[PDB]
Subunit: 59 residues, 2 copies
RNA sequence: GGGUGUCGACGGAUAGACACCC
RNA sequence: GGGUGUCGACGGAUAGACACCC
């Protein structure tokens, strides 16, 4: 676990091919943008488990 | 860019070896937790540019 | 046009949808 | 004990630090 703090409108990074941007917040919601090549996957934690379980939307 | 929305206390995922967690907010700050192996790097956008420019802090 | 909260979404979009207030 | 804003940090920690108000 590595915690960081970020004001809305700033950015964060992962690996050498991924970037993240805190687009903003509302109440307790947070718009979080991600920038990665389709060479890698990105999903919510409630969806990531499904890409690993047998799929339901291949195409 | 792939935007997502998350209430504080929930999570998101990247690749097959990284996880993210919206630990919370404060004013306009956002505590963001990250969980990845030391086999890969993770930093702020104001620090990532430095791991790509030069350093001496590593082992 | 602005503010606030909530929602929906394997969505790759600096994205949307709804309600309330000015 | 509670609320709010800000700060610091290549830090791998559900992490810290400060100020204001009750």
């Amino acid at each position: 676990m590595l915690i960081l703090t970020r004001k809305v409108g700033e950015s964060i990074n992962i690996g050498d091919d991924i970037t993240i941007t805190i687009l903003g917040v509302s109440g307790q919601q947070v718009r979080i943008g991600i920038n990665a090549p389709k060479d890698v996957a990105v999903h919510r934690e409630e969806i990531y488990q499904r890409i690993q379980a047998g799929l339901t939307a291949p195409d």
